[PDB]
Amino acid sequence: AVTCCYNFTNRKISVQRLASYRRITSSKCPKEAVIFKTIVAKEICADPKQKWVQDSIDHLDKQT
Amino acid sequence: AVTCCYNFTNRKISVQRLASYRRITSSKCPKEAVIFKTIVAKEICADPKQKWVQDSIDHLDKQT
Amino acid sequence: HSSGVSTQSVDLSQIKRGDEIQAHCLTPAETEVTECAGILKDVLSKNLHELQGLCNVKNKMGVPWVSVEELGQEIITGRLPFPSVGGTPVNDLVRVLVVAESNTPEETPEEEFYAYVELQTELYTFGLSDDNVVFTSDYMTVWMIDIPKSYVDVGMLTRATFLEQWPGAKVTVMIPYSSTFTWCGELGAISEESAPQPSLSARSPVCKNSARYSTSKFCEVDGCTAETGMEKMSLLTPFGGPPQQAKMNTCPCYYKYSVSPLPAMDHLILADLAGLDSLTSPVYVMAAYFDSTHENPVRPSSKLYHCALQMTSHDGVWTSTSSEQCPIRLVEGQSQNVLQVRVAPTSMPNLVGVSLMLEGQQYRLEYFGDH
Amino acid sequence: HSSGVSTQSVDLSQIKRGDEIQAHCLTPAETEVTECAGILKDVLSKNLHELQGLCNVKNKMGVPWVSVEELGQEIITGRLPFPSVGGTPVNDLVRVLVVAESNTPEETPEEEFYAYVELQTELYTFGLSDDNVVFTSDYMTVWMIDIPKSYVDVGMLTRATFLEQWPGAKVTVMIPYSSTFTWCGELGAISEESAPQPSLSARSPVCKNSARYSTSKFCEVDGCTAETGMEKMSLLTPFGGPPQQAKMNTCPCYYKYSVSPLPAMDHLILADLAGLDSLTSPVYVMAAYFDSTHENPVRPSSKLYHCALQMTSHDGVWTSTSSEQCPIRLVEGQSQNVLQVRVAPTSMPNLVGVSLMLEGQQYRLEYFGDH
């Protein structure tokens, strides 16, 4: 039931294809990660430290 | 007319196939070398520092 | 036979000056033969075959005698099935031991035993000269030489030149991968006619086209799901192979390459071995990985590592050695007839390979490249 | 065009803070972007294209735009035709500069320019992260990163990911081979459909089956005798190629491998180039060799070297630079329309390769291996 991130994409995603996004919170998970959900219902692992991830987060937030 | 040695064989030769042997003496040559002549009239470059070359030389000498 | 794979325990304690050998002979210490030369004379004279006790594994292949009429050179050459990735330019040096010998002929021969061994790589050819000698006897020679680990791998060619087709003639290359693990690559001379008779040593790239594992897209097709417990086993042991059966799992590739959320797993089985109930020699499993600590993004230190574990039988029970560093570990599978190689999913990203060595079988699993 | 080979002189004296760049940006100095980051800001702001003046040679290939609908990633990837052998595990590090840019679109785009470059090798993938940035502008980014020279060679793959198919988009890899020579590998994006349009860059193994040259046996057949002056020339420039004509000689292989007495020669011509009377850019010739000084047979230091010479035209006359170390040298051939690459026969044993670079043509001559 629980899925985690073991690798982060070092490649930015067009904010035009990112539906939602949640943060990893489960204790069964080993890495702190931001999971982006695309407009095609696909999830991808990202790194919070990275600026494009953060900024992409300021957009997803200031739109709801 | 003058030929020289630019590489020495690191492989020993059976004293049973070595006819004669001469030393490089020409000034037009860059490396100090012992040239072994086989029983098949073929020459090979050797290294004086090496013991098998020297010993192979003690045989070729104490037989004439 | 003229070829095969063997294993034995290596207790340095009960090996004459064992510690000393491993220190000056198998470790890149002094830049001269003297130290090791003087230790071998003491040891090898009391026992001319002692060095065989230092190999945890021995992999031998039968090579045809190629002759050189013109010079009277009987030559044997071969490509050893190196167990793991040698290293990275960033690694240090390995001090390998080379042994050339043959059976002592009951009839005094014409010339004195002789052998010239040279290990060639695409660029440089390391030729064991006289200055490398650390021991000599009527029918045996030992050389010592330091080589950048990256060079010791597939590609390196071994060539031994003799003046006769000595009986029982063979060359050995002792390669220490870890302070406590030594692998011996041996070449045995066989008749001119005979065709090369290798050992059952295979090399398998587990993640061909690592791009395929960049996401969870093919997970379902590959059969790598929380359901099957991320297990997609393939057989490694051929149809004629020994009574033991080894297999590999490719699902870890996802955990090494995926940027898609994957099933949380306590561990991951990289491979398993069946038939321990009948096996009588230990089982070794070496792992090649990169250190976890991160480095300066401006200068990524790619230093490769190796740790070898060993599953042995004590009074019929099999147990595994362990390392507080090693990313993998050996555990008993279902019963005491099955052995498992495990690892934490978080270790995968830095795992390069693993090699399974047991009586008559050797497998080199690569988690990179496509060949 | 979408591909090609260029050359120009690189006078650091007349290049803003040139010395400083080459010192902190192209030399593996500080383990941080700060120094180089602060020099680029001063220089690149006064002139955003200054770095182009540091390349003595530029080799560019046209690569198709591969798209990733799902993520909106327009990606270009390619394998640069590296001029020479990178190095040996025994070598040190090269600090390469990477530049990603595109044409400034007259119409303000939706998102900000973006590019993620990563250089992958069979083992590790060096990805130019944020921590590697040493410069940024509206439509340009510069990264800095140290890599073990042995890694920079054929095998290394270059990949640039953008979010759009930017116009004039291209990635450049500045590789300094010697303190005074820098080679720039460039990737230019072309239409999705278009097929890869490389440059006239070839790699040629001059001594295939080096065994063939172990003795003078095939000398007569090969046409390598004191008579012809040890010259067996083959054409390198194809039928459609530029107005200049380059050729290679394979007779040196004997002087590199032979253990049979060979004809004493003052020098040996490795290659020649015809058509200088019409060429308007300099000609460079880089050599890759091992240091002559001998090393401990117990630990053969295989440190590779590179020296690049340059034949230029001054008032119509062509002259060559020179090095008291470089094993090769450039001399005018018959006339001023012919150029020659020479070397002393005694240098051959340690010569690994040579590369001839001139307007529209690049050739990598290898004196080892069979591919």
Q: How far C106 CA lies from chain D's nearest CA (Å)?
A: 34
Report how far residue D366's alpha carbon sits from residue C361's, in angstroms, rounded to the nearest whole number.
38
Quick one: tokens of C12?
């340095």
Interchain proximity C114–B13, CB inside 8 Å = no
Sequential DSSP letters for D28-94: ---SSSHHHHHHHHHHHHH-TTGGGGG-SEEEEEEEE-EEETTTTEEEEEE----SS----TTS-EE
Please state, in angstroms and rounded to a whole number, the distance separating the CA atoms of residues C273 and C334. 11
CB-CB under 8 Å, C262 with A6: yes
Q: Which two tokens stand for residue C5?
A: 């794979």
Among candidates C82, C96, C95, C105, which has minimal Cα distance to C162? Answer: C105
Residues 6+ away with beta carbon under 8 Å from D179? D22, D27
Q: How many helices (H) and strands (E) does chain A have?
A: 1, 4
CB-based contact C57:C6 (threshold 8 Å) = yes
Task: For residue C2, count CB atoms less than 10 angstroms from its CB and return exposed for 0-12, middle for 13-18, buried for 19 or more.
Answer: middle
Q: CA quadruple D138, D144, D149, D155: dihedral positive or negative?
A: negative
Helix (H, G, I), strand (E, B) or coil at D189: strand
* Distance from C-alpha of D231 to C-alpha of D270, rounded to nearest angstrom: 9
Annotation: CATH topology of A1-64: OB fold (Dihydrolipoamide Acetyltransferase, E2P) (2.40.50)
Touching, A vs D (3+ Cβ pairs under 8 A)? yes
- Chain D residue numbers with beta carbons less than 8 Å from the beta carbon of A11 are 71, 73, 116, 161
Q: Which long-range contacts (CB under 8 A, 24 or more apart) does A35-39 make?
A: A35/A5, A35/C261, A38/A13, A38/D70, A38/D71
Q: How far apart are CA C353 and CA C230, in angstroms?
A: 19
Per-position DSSP letters for D263-283, written without gaps between them: E--S-EEEEEEE-TTT--S-E
CB contact at 8 A, C231 and C275: no
Burial of C317 (0-12, 13-18, 19+ CB in 10 A): exposed
Three-state DSSP at B15 gives helix
Q: Which residue in the block uniquely carries the two structure tokens 């198919």?
A: D165
Residues of chain B contacting D264 with CB distance shorter than 8 Å = 2-4, 26, 28-29
- In three-state secondary structure terms, D157 is strand
Phi-psi region of C333 (alpha: psi -120 to 50; beta: other; left: phi over 0): beta
Residue D208: CB partners within 8 Å, gap ≥ 6?
D370
- Token output for C37: 């030369």
Chain B environment of C163 (Cβ under 8 Å): 12, 14
Distance from the C198 Cα atom to the nearest Cα atom in chain D, whole angstroms? 24
Question: CB distance C150–D122 less than 8 Å?
Answer: no
3-class DSSP state for residue D23?
A: helix
Whether B and A touch (3+ CB pairs < 8 Å), yes or no: no
Q: How far is CA D183 from the centre of its chain?
A: 5
Pick the closest to residue C313 from C282, C356, C274 (CA basis): C282
Measure the CA–CA gap between C161 and C66, rounded to whole angstroms. 9
Q: Which residue has the tokens 């086209």?
A: C209
Which among C90, C129, C368 has CB closest to D148?
C90
Q: What are phi and psi of C7, to 5 degrees?
A: -145, 155
Number of helices (H), then strands (E), in chain B: 1, 4
Asked if D100 has any chain A CB less than 8 Å from its own CB, the reply is no
Structure tokens at C105: 């002929």
Calpha distance D198→C15 (Å, rounded): 61
Total residues belonging to chain A: 64
Q: Cα torsion at D343, D347, D351, D353 (round to 10°)?
A: 0
Runs of H (alpha helix) within D119-275: 219-222, 252-257
CA dihedral of residues D6, D10, D16, D21 (deg, nearest 10): 90
Question: Is any Cβ of chain B less than 8 angstroms from the Cβ of C163?
Answer: yes
Helix or strand run (H / E) with residue D172: strand D170-178
Residue pair D271/D365 in contact (Cβ under 8 Å)? The answer is yes
Cβ separation D259–B29 shorter than 8 A = no
Quick check: C182 and C26 in contact, CB under 8 A? yes
CB contact under 8 A, D31 and C298: yes
Rounded-to-integer distance, Cα C190 and Cα C200, Å: 18
Q: Which residues of chain C neighbour D131 with C-beta distances below 8 Å? A: 297-298
On whether any CB of chain D is under 8 Å from the CB of B28, the answer is: yes
Distance CA D220, CA D72 (A): 62
Strands C66-68 and D116-120: unpaired
Nearest to D261 among B5, B28, B30 (CB): B5
Sign of the Cα pseudo-torsion (D189, D193, D194, D196, in order): positive
Q: Are D95 and D110 in contact (CB under 8 A)?
A: no
Q: What is d(CA D142, CA D130) in angstroms, rounded to the nearest whole number?
A: 10
Selected for mutation to probe chain A from C214, C251, C260 (highest A CB count within 10 Å) is C260
Contact between chains at D110 and A16 (C-beta distance less than 8 A)? yes
Rg (alpha carbons) of chain C, rounded to whole number: 22
Size of chain C, expressed as the number of residues it contains: 371
Among B4, B5, B6, B31, the residue to mutate for chain D (most D Cβ within 10 A): B6
Which two structure tokens, joined as six digits, stand for D92? 């040190």
In whole angstroms, give the CA distance from residue D257 to residue D246.
24
| C56 and C183 Cβ atoms separated by less than 8 Å | yes
Residues across chain D: 371
Tell me the nearest-neighbour CA distance from D80 into chain A, angstroms.
Answer: 22
User: Which among B6, B28, B42 has the least Cβ separation from residue D258?
Assistant: B6
In this structure, the number of other CB atoms found within 10 A of the CB of residue C335 comes to 9
Given an 8 Å threshold on Cβ–Cβ distance, is D346 in contact with B30? yes
Q: Which of A10, A15, A38 sits opposite D70 (nearest CB)?
A: A38
Q: Compute the C-alpha angle D291/D293/D298, nearest 5°.
A: 100
Q: Which residues pair with C287 in a beta bridge?
A: C307, C354
Subunit contact C263:A2, Cβ cutoff 8 A? yes
Angle of CA points D259, D264, D267, to nearest 5° = 105
CB of A41 less than 8 A from some CB of D: no
Q: How far is A14 from chain D (nearest CA, A)?
A: 6
Closest residue of chain D to B7, computed from CA coordinates: D259
Is residue C342 a contact partner of residue C331, using CB atoms and an 8 Å limit?
yes
Which of C110, C116, C130 has its CB closest to that of B11?
Answer: C116
Q: Do C132 and D298 touch (CB under 8 A)?
A: yes
Provide the shortest C-alpha distance from residue B11 to chain C (in Å).
Answer: 7
The last residues before gaps in chain C (C-N over 2.5 Å) are: none
Q: What are the residues facing C155 on neighbouring strands?
A: none
**Cβ within 8 Å of residue A47, ≥6 positions away:** A8, A10, A33, A34, A53
What's the N-to-C CA distance of chain C in angstroms? 29
Cβ–Cβ gap D70/A12 under 8 Å: no
Contacts of C260 in chain A (CB under 8 A): 42-45
D289 close to D350: Cβ distance less than 8 angstroms: yes
Q: Which residues of D334-346 are buried (b: 16+ CB within 10 A; e: fewer)?
A: eeebbbbbbbebb
- D35 Cβ neighbours under 8 A, 6+ residues apart: D24, D29
Q: Which residues contact C21 (CB under 8 A, 6 or more apart)?
A: C15, C36, C39, C40, C43, C51, C54
Surface-to-core class of residue D195, CB atoms within 10 Å of its CB (0-12 exposed, 13-18 middle, 19+ buried): exposed
Q: Do C259 and A9 touch (CB under 8 A)?
A: yes
Q: Which residue has the tokens 């407009």?
A: A39
Those residues with Cβ within 8 angstroms of residue D84's Cβ, 6 or more apart along the chain or in another chain: D177, D286, D288, D306, D353, D355, D364
Cβ partners under 8 Å of residue C335, min gap 6: C277
The count of residues in chain B is 64
Kindly report the three-state secondary structure assignment for every residue of C31-82.
Answer: CCCHHHHHHHHHHHHHCCCHHHHHCCEEEEEEEECEEECCCCEEEEEECCCC
* Dihedral sign for Cα atoms in the order C122, C128, C134, C140: positive
Question: Which residue is closest to D159 within chain A, CA to CA?
Answer: A11
Contact check, Cβ <8 Å, A6/C264: no
Domain over C200-371 is classified CATH 2.40.30.170:
no
Give the three-class secondary structure for D178.
strand
Breaks (C-N over 2.5 A) in chain A follow: none
Reduce the secondary structure of chain C to three states and give it as a string. CCCEEEECCCCHHHCCCHHHHHHHCCCCCCCCCHHHHHHHHHHHHHCCCHHHHHCCEEEEEEEECEEECCCCEEEEEECCCCCCCCCCCCCCEEEEEEEEECCCCCCCCCCCCCCEEEEECCCCEEECCCCCEEEEECCEEEEEEEEEHHHCCECEEEEEEECCCCCCCEEEEEEEEECCEEEEEEEEEECCCCCCECCCEEEEECCCCHHHHCCCCCHHHHCCCCCCCCCCEEECCCCCCCCCEEEEECCHHHHHHCCCCEECCCCEEEEEEECCCCCCCCEEEEEEEECCCCCCCCCCCCCEEEEEEEEEEECCEEEECCCCCCCEEEEECCCCCEEEEEECCCCHHHEEEEEEEECCEEEEEECCCCC
Residue B10 to residue C70, Cβ atoms within 8 A? no
Q: Where are the domains of chain A?
A: 1-64
User: Do D341 and D328 contact (CB within 8 A), yes or no?
Assistant: yes
Query: Cα separation of D27 and C129, whole Å?
Result: 38
Residue of D nearest to A42 (CA): D70
Mention every residue, 6+ apart, whose C-beta is less than 8 A from residue D236: D202, D204, D246, D247, D248, D271, D356, D361, D363
Is B4 part of the contact surface with chain D (CB cutoff 8 Å)? yes
Nearest to A29 by CA among A4, A59, A55, A54: A4
| Distant-in-sequence, close-in-space partners of C261: CB < 8 Å, separation ≥ 6 | A3, A4, A5, A35, A43, A45, C216
Q: Assess A38–C contact: CB distance below 8 Å, yes or no.
A: no
Question: In this complex, do D260 and B30 lie within 8 Å of one another by their Cβ atoms?
Answer: no
Query: What are the residues facing C343 on neighbouring strands?
Result: C268, C328
- C71 contacts in chain B (CB < 8 Å): 11, 13-14, 17, 38, 44
| Furthest CA-CA distance within chain B | 31
Closest CA to C162 of C154, C153, C171: C171
Residue-range domain boundaries for chain D: 1-199, 200-371
Q: Chains B, D: CB contacts under 8 A, how many?
A: 44
Comparing C-alpha atoms, which of C215, C311, C312 is closest to residue C254?
Answer: C215
Tell me whether residues D262 and B4 touch, CB distance under 8 A. yes
Answer whether B20 touches D (CB < 8 Å): no
Pairing assessment for the beta strands D57-64 and D181-190 based on DSSP bridges: parallel
The answer for C 242-271 residues in CB contact with A (under 8 A) is: 255-264
How many whole angstroms separate alpha carbon C190 and alpha carbon D364? 41
Question: Other CB atoms closer than 10 Å to residue A8's CB: what's the count?
Answer: 19
Q: Which residue has the tokens 């220089």?
A: D43
Give this entry's resolution in angstroms: 2.8
**From the CA atom positions of chain B, what is the Rg in Å?**
11
Q: What is the largest CA-CA distance in chain A?
A: 31
Give the gap in angstroms from C-alpha D357 to the nearest C-alpha of chain A: 35
Q: How far apart are CA C93 and CA C96, in angstroms?
A: 9
Contacts of B15 in chain C (CB under 8 A): 111
DSSP string across D85-140: ----TTS-EEEEEEEEE----SS--SS----EEEEE-SS-EEE--STTEEEEETTE
- Is D297 in the B-facing interface, judged by CB distances under 8 Å? no
Adjacent-strand bridge partners of C145: C96
How big is the C-D interface in CB pairs under 8 Å?
A: 86
Classified as helix, coil or strand, A20 is strand
CA D96 to chain centre: 12
Q: Do residues D276 and D232 touch, judged by C-beta distance below 8 A?
A: no
Q: Does the C1-199 domain belong in CATH 2.60.40.1330?
A: yes
